[PDB]
From a paper:
RNA guanine-7 methyltransferase (RNMT) catalyses the transfer of a methyl group from S-adenosylmethionine (SAM) to the cap intermediate to form the cap m7G(5′)ppp(X) and the by-product S-adenosylhomocysteine (SAH). RNMT was identified based on homology to the yeast and viral homologues and in vitro activity. This basic cap structure (cap 0, m7G(5′)ppp(X)) protects RNA from degradation by nucleases during synthesis and recruits factors involved in RNA processing and translation initiation. RNMT has an activating co-factor RNMT-activating miniprotein (RAM) clamped at the interface of the catalytic domain and the modular lobe 416–456. Consequently, RNMT is a target of interest in cancers and immune disorders.
Since attempts to crystallise RNMT with the G(5′)ppp(5′)G (cap) had been unsuccessful, we co-crystallised RNMT with the cap surrogate, GMP-PnP. GMP-PnP was confirmed as a cap competitive inhibitor with a Ki of 2.3 µM (0.9–5.5 µM). Crystallisation of RNMT with GMP-PnP provides the first structural characterisation of a Class I methyltransferase in a complex with a cap analogue and Sinefungin. HsRNMT–Sinefungin–GMP-PnP, HsRNMT–SAH–DDD1060606 and HsRNMT–SAH–DDD1870799 co-complexes were solved, respectively, at 2.5, 2.0 and 2.4 Å in space group P21. The Sinefungin molecule is well resolved in the electron density map for both chains of the asymmetric unit and shares a common network of interaction to that observed for SAH binding to HsRNMT. GMP-PnP was successfully built in just one of the chains in the asymmetric unit and is located between the α-helix A and the β-strands 8/9. When co-crystallised with HsRNMT and Sinefungin, the GMP-PnP guanine moiety is stabilised within the cap pocket by hydrogen bonds to residues H288, Y289, E370, Y467 and the Sinefungin 5-amino group, as well as through a Pi-stacking interaction with F285. The GMP-PnP ribose makes two hydrogen bonds with N176, whereas the beta-gamma pyrophosphate group interacts with the polypeptide chain via two salt bridges to K208. Finally, the distance measured between the Sinefungin 5-amino group and the guanine N7 (2.4 Å) alongside the angle formed by C5/5-NH2/N7 (140°) confirms that GMP-PnP is observed in an ideal orientation to permit the methyl transfer, similar to the predicted model published. SAH and Sinefungin are stabilised in the active site through an identical network of hydrogen bonds, involving residues K180, G205, D227, D261, S262 and Q284, as well as 2 salt bridges with K180. These results support the hypothesis that Sinefungin binds in the SAM-binding site in the presence or absence of the cap.
Numbering used by the authors: 170 to 419, 456 to 476
């Protein structure tokens, strides 16, 4: 609950910062790609952002349709006077070109949001490159590719400090297959969060992600650990009060250990 809620706060502040960056130029017709949208847990953040068009895509067809129904549920509120239009696409973004699936092949995006997703595409080089292409190729110049991914530096640091192939606490466990072997692609580990799931992830060496993004003319805006990001954004008072409205003034030490494995990143498309 508290970890989910804290990640929502991180996504709210992150989406909020870059919606305003986009609006500090074009306030009109803001088009967003939500790569790996999941069950639609970001729809209300895009609604509060007052965007115009949202493309939600996920690999699980089940999730895409609950995301589509959740959007239809939202637009039948009385609160949804001008809710964004949306399309919902089932696709493997690490294997399929998404513009093959758009109703408008030539559409452009101001933001691509890829939250807790891109580390599933580092199974191989072509999959990581395909996801970057689906995320960045159709970005308008000056548009943003933002997202959250595990920090490989902090992952390895804790794995070496451990004396087994595992580490964690009562909230989470990370189990690597072998210690001391960290290939750029396919470095598989299992991430278990006590409550939620058990899904295999791949290590993302961020300098590599930074270099591959250059292929689509992306320049790194910033890269922060979850702790660096929290400490910086908590100084803005409306961020601080959003934290208190969401009931996040008291995260456990065990929850900080879990959430401090992650980083946020932002790339911008050049002219
Ligand atoms: N290659 C892939 N292409 C598209 N979606 C994927 C892919 N791999 C995993 N996903 C989906 O990415 C999502 C990962 C979730 N942790 C993120 C959900 C949502 N974006 C959130 O921030 O809450 C899941 O819904 C996956 O089904």
């Amino acid at each position: 609950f508290y970890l989910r809620n804290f990640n929502n706060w991180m996504k709210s502040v992150l989406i909020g910062e870059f919606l305003e960056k986009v609006r500090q130029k074009k306030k009109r017709d803001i088009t967003v790609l939500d790569l790996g949208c999941g069950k639609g847990g970001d729809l209300l953040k895009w609604k509060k952002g007052r965007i115009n068009k949202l493309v939600c895509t996920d690999i699980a067809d089940v999730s895409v349709k609950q995301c589509q129904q959740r959007y239809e549920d939202m637009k039948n509120r009385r609160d949804s006077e001008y809710i964004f239009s949306a399309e919902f696409i089932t696709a493997d973004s690490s294997k399929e070109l998404l513009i093959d699936k758009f109703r408008d092949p030539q559409m452009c995006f101001d933001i691509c949001s890829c939250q807790f997703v891109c580390h599933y595409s580092f199974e191989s080089y072509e999959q990581a490159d395909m996801m970057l292409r689906n995320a960045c190729e159709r970005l308008s110049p000056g548009g943003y590719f933002i997202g959250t991914t595990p920090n490989s530096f902090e992952l390895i640091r804790r794995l070496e400090a451990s004396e087994t192939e595992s580490f964690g606490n009562e909230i989470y466990t990370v189990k690597f297959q072998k210690k001391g072997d960290y290939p750029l692609f396919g470095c598989k580990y299992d991430f278990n969060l006590e409550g939620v799931v058990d899904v295999p992830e791949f290590l993302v060496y961020f300098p590599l992600l930074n270099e591959m993004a250059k292929k689509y003319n992306m320049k790194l805006v910033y890269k922060k650990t979850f702790l660096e990001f929290y400490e910086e954004k908590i100084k803005n008072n409306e961020n601080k009060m959003l934290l208190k409205r969401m009931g996040l003034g008291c995260l456990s030490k065990s929850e900080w250990e879990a959430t401090s494995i992650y980083l946020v990143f932002a790339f911008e498309k050049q002219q």
